[PDB]
Design a protein around this ligand. Structure first.
Ligand SMILES: O[C@@H]1[C@@H](O)[C@H](O)OC[C@H]1O
Length: 377
């Protein structure tokens, strides 16, 4: 039985021997540094009285990924002021009010709110919806735009029904219940697959969609079993609907284990923690930990999914360590405890490339302290 059924969350830091008081002090310090830390560390920036953005420090833009990530961190940490600032920014500058992307979010804008491209990123929308359902369940709905449950339902309505609304496209392929990479293209990104969020969409979304979300949870669990390498546990950044690496795209080669794919190990582990439905998840978690058990974080490379290293280093090696450590929610092999301790002894990333590492780092600090929870009712 998972944490969803029992209400009890694994505290992997405590099980590894860290004191309960040092653990919550460490979680609170990680929040304080990431949202309000020094100019080399923070990724959150307040704007006026009622807005704020999560900065992709590397790309110098604001991404629906980072904004939605910030909202999840804020609601898990019970930080409504920051949540409402981030949400108002996304609502005000990023959410489309008309056209083929109506109710979707432009995937990135300039920090001043100027849209750079109108096309959305589905991992944004699904984090926005889940964080808004948790905000509703934790704090209750306020007046629009802080009518959190209705805002979440609106996003997920568009995700499934955009094709009925206008000339646009849904973010899930109706035939196989799989999340797509972008609405227009017939392939996926394994790191976008959140079966644990779809289980909760099957509870909280518009009634007419609840069967679909239930089927989407089952379909995504099955999809990750086809996408992850059976020896290494590594997955490609983009994958066909059959789980094989997608073709090289005009904008790059996404066939390998790099930035996006790191989140798969974390996503699988949190589904196991919450729902404990697919015991393959334990073996997948053991496999990726075994693959990296012997590899120093500073030596992390790009890898083919069969484990062949490139000369090229990982761009986000602290991010990779974070997702490898979060796999200890499911892994029961001989590496689980060492990854937890390695992670504990790893500080936040500083400087230009810090955004992606520090987002993954924070989700891992939440999950390993038993503080990445379902907020119900
Ligand atoms: O937005 C992320 C970017 O900042 C990182 O560098 O690569 C992965 C992306 O998802």
């Amino acid at each position: 039985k998972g944490a969803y059924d029992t209400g009890t969350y694994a505290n992997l830091f405590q099980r590894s021997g860290y004191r309960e008081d040092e653990i919550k002090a460490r979680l609170e310090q990680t929040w304080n540094d990431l949202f309000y830390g020094d100019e080399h560390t923070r990724i959150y920036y307040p704007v006026g009285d009622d807005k704020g953005y999560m900065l992709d420090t590397g790309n110098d833009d604001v991404r629906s990924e980072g904004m939605s990530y910030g909202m999840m961190m804020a609601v898990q940490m019970d930080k409504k002021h920051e949540f409402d600032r981030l949400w108002n920014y996304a609502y005000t500058y990023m959410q489309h009010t008309e056209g083929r992307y109506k109710d979707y979010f432009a995937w990135h804008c300039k920090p001043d709110g100027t849209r750079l491209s109108p096309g959305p990123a589905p991992d944004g929308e699904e984090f926005f919806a889940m964080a808004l359902f948790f905000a509703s369940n934790r704090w209750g709905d306020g007046p629009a735009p802080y009518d959190y449950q209705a805002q979440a339902r609106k996003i997920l309505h568009a995700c499934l029904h955009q094709g009925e609304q206008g000339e646009g496209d849904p973010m899930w392929e109706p035939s196989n219940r799989l999340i797509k990479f972008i609405p227009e293209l017939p392939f996926s990104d394994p790191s976008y697959h959140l079966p644990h969020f779809y289980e909760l969409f099957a509870q909280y979304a518009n009634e007419q969609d609840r069967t679909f979300w239930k089927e989407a949870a089952e379909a995504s669990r099955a999809y990750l079993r086809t996408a992850c390498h059976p020896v290494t546990g590594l997955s490609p950044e983009y994958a066909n609907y059959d789980g094989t690496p997608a073709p090289v795209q005009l904008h790059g080669d996404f066939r390998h284990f790099y930035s996006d794919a790191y989140r798969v190990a974390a996503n699988v582990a949190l589904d196991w923690e919450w729902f404990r439905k697919d015991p393959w998840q334990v073996q997948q978690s053991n496999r990726i930990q075994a693959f990296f058990s012997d590899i120093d974080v500073s030596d992390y490379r790009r890898y083919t999914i069969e484990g062949e290293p490139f000369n090229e280093p990982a761009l986000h090696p602290v991010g990779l360590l974070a997702t490898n450590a979060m796999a200890s929610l499911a892994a029961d092999g001989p590496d689980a405890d060492s990854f937890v301790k390695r992670f504990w002894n790893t500080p936040l990333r500083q400087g230009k490339r810090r955004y992606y590492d520090n987002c993954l780092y924070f989700f891992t600090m939440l999950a390993l302290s038993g503080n990445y929870r379902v907020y119900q009712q």
